């Protein structure tokens, strides 16, 4: 059914601004939200249908200590997103406390939209981990949503931050976010600043303006992850139908990304699949193995070869997995949109549950464990100490994330049939 995106924090607000803009041009929408003369899609799930064809995204924009929310307002697309729902520290504790006083007005803004929709399916957060204001406020709002909508689900386009390690409290902030994210988020899609920065260095010479260019990379993945839902067809029509295959255990819900034409600016299906399993096409930075893999292709794809193609990759075995699950790589197919360029006539993406992402979680847990002993940055800011005098949520978070680190490696073992 219709999905409401809670884009929050300066970094999160930057990737929601672009994601909606990306679906503006891709769909038949202008910068004023009006349909255009030039422009068969299920526009409804991602866009509210107004009366005079003003298809307004159901975006919830939360601004805290706003600077980049003012720049979003001075844009040609300011009219495109007008649910008229925008409401006024670098510490996780500093963000969580600020969110608690304004929780009811931000929560009424959630209600208004929920009333507008016929059936609400999911809350998709453009979350920033260790995002200063973005983290802490995002964890708190993550906890409120599940209690109010126990039946409903929450996804997170977490931009997990890896910049080669400025935030001196970055590990502490991230540590707290995951504990909330592991028990209070049904799904999470992981992205990495360094992994994309390495891709940016690979495809282009761009190094210093890494954040502006990488926004486009995060966007192409984000638009792409939903293309099966937005367009018509009997292909995984709903979100939940798709979510089940990618996440096979309540605890392991983190998803890796990849894009066969990183240089998207003919190709047979057999080729676009093999290219993806290679690790340059991946955008994330003891035996290790995938838990279940899925792929979606949008272009001029022949249908008869896919079975021949499904069998060819299996014989190559470019993707090595031995999970407690009996899961298989799955082939899915969609239509590339008209109007926008058809370059790389065939172009694909993959979303997969991989135990390698455990390593990225352990690296921040490693920085934190080292930092915890030193107590170099306890902040001891009165907000930090008064909010957390015991400082035991960090230890509660440390055991919960360690259980997660343990569970992952248990998945690699032959007996995840038994307790993680």
């Amino acid at each position: 059914r219709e999905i409401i995106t809670l884009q929050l924090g300066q970094c999160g607000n930057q990737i929601g601004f672009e994601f909606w803009k990306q679906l503006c041009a891709e769909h038949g929408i202008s910068p004023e939200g009006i349909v255009e003369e030039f422009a068969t899609d299920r526009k409804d799930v991602f866009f509210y249908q107004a009366d005079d064809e003003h298809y307004i995204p159901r975006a919830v924009l939360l601004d805290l200590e706003p600077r980049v929310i003012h720049s979003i307002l001075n844009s040609p697309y300011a009219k495109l997103y007008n649910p008229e729902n925008i409401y006024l520290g670098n510490n996780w504790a500093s963000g969580f406390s600020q969110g608690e006083k304004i929780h009811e007005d931000i929560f009424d803004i959630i209600d208004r939209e929920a009333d507008g929709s016929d059936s609400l399916e999911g809350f998709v957060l453009c979350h920033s981990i260790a995002g200063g204001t973005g983290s802490g406020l995002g964890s708190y709002l993550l906890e409120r949503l599940n209690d109010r909508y126990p039946k409903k689900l929450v996804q997170t386009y977490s931009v997990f931050p890896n910049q080669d390690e400025d935030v001196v409290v970055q590990p502490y902030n991230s540590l707290l976010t995951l504990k909330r994210l592991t028990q209070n988020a049904d799904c999470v899609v992981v992205l990495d600043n360094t992994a994309l920065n390495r891709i940016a260095t690979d495809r282009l010479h761009i190094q210093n303006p890494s954040f502006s260019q990488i926004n486009q990379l995060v966007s192409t993945i984000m638009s792409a992850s939903t293309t099966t839902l937005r367009y018509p067809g009997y292909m995984n029509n709903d979100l939940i139908g798709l979510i089940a295959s990618l996440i096979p255990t309540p605890r392991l819900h983190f998803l890796m990304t990849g894009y066969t034409p990183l240089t998207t600016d003919k190709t047979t299906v057999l080729d676009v699949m093999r290219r993806l399993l290679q690790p340059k096409n991946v955008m994330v930075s003891t035996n290790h193995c995938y838990i279940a893999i899925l792929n979606i292709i949008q272009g001029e794809v022949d249908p008869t070869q896919v079975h021949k193609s499904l069998q060819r990759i299996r014989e190559r075995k470019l993707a090595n997995f031995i999970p407690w699950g009996p899961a298989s790589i799955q082939v899915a197919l969609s239509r590339k949109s008209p109007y926008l360029p058809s370059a790389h006539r065939v172009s694909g993406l993959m979303m997969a549950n991989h135990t390698s992402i455990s390593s990225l979680f352990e690296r921040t847990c490693r920085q934190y464990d080292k930092l915890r002993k030193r107590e170099a940055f306890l902040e001891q800011f009165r907000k930090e100490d008064m909010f957390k005098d015991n400082f035991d949520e960090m230890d509660t978070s440390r055991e919960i994330v360690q259980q997660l680190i343990d569970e992952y490696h248990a998945a690699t073992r032959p007996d995840y049939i038994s307790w993680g």
Partner: protein
């Protein structure tokens, strides 16, 4: 040439094999009928006499040669058949209406046949057609209204002859403008619609039955092993998720071939072979052609339906003698899944 019925008294209408002279082969006789039926529904009138001069020429010659007779019948076959294709592909939009048969009839649409089952679930009881019959069509038309999909749409009608057991669909064609779609052919499309509906309905229950990530395990440890359904949800899902990916290639492969062949050839009678092969392959390849395999798959489907039932009522995790039901189900799925190794054989 003129289409006149009963040009003479006995000894639309069709072949009278007992009175066909032996030397005129049964195959040359069949060609005559097609030329004949089409005239009633051309450029034949423009060159009608030229073809009557030749048929006149065959009258003058002293002896009968089949080698000569066919060549006329065949020439006349060439133009009369080319005419039906000449129009149906361009002025009857033959290719464009096919998108309409697949989109609303072979479950090729996502919004109309998914949201319809959510807003019509109540028809699960046996109906006498007294009230539910009006309410399901009412539901279908309402279903489409949620997001656009609101142009014409008067023709599609659902009918009830177990609330979801019978929902055979019927489209109304323009008969002078469509002889390709017939009373017999749309019946076979109907059999597939009912079977392809069964898989779609079961896969909805399982994805919904995935409310463990959504509620029971979310924020609550509850009991693990002591109070779990063994998460057989994952194994039932593969035998039901895999059929859906299979059904995506048996249907989508054929529709690429029927809509590319139709484009190359130029006689309506031939195109009719393409379509009568496009539906003929969809049946056996999908396994709907009745077989032991389809029967095993339907049993798998009924067991799946019952497993949805157990978890549905339990609510907060508990075993109200749930194990006894789970035990019949876990044993049953294993026995039946082994029958799916007949395919391996």
């Amino acid at each position: 040439l003129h289409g006149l019925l009963l040009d003479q008294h006995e000894e639309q209408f069709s072949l009278r094999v007992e009175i066909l002279p032996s030397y005129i082969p049964v195959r040359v006789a069949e060609k005559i009928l097609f030329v004949g039926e089409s005239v009633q529904m051309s450029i034949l009138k423009n060159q009608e006499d030229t073809f009557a001069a030749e048929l006149h020429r065959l009258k003058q010659q002293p002896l009968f040669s089949l080698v000569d007779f066919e060549q006329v019948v065949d020439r006349i076959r060439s133009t009369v058949a080319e005419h039906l294709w000449k129009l149906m592909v361009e002025e009857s939009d033959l290719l464009g209406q096919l998108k309409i048969i697949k989109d609303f009839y072979l479950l090729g649409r996502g919004e109309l046949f998914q949201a319809f089952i959510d807003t019509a679930q109540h028809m699960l009881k046996t109906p006498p057609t007294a009230v539910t019959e009006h309410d399901v069509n009412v539901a279908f038309q309402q279903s489409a209204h949620k997001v656009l999909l609101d142009d014409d749409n008067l023709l599609p009608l659902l009918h009830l002859t177990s609330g979801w057991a019978a929902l055979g669909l019927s489209y109304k064609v323009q008969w002078p403008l469509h002889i390709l779609f017939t009373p017999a052919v749309l019946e076979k499309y109907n059999v597939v619609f009912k079977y392809l509906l069964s898989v779609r309905r079961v896969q909805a229950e399982l994805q919904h039955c995935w409310a463990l990530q959504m509620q029971r395990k979310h924020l609550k440890s509850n009991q693990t092993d002591a109070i779990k359904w063994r998460l057989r949800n994952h194994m039932a899902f593969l035998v039901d998720n895999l059929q859906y990916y299979l059904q995506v290639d048996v249907l989508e492969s054929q529709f690429s071939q029927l809509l590319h062949q139709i484009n190359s050839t130029r006689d309506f009678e031939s195109i009719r072979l393409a379509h009568d092969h496009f539906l003929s392959n969809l049946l056996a390849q999908s396994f709907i052609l009745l077989k032991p395999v389809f029967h095993c798959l339907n049993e798998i489907l009924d067991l799946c339906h019952s497993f949805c039932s157990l978890v549905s009522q339990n609510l907060g995790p508990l075993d109200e003698r749930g194990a006894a039901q789970l035990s019949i189900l876990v044993k049953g799925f294993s026995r039946q899944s082994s029958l799916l190794f007949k395919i391996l054989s």
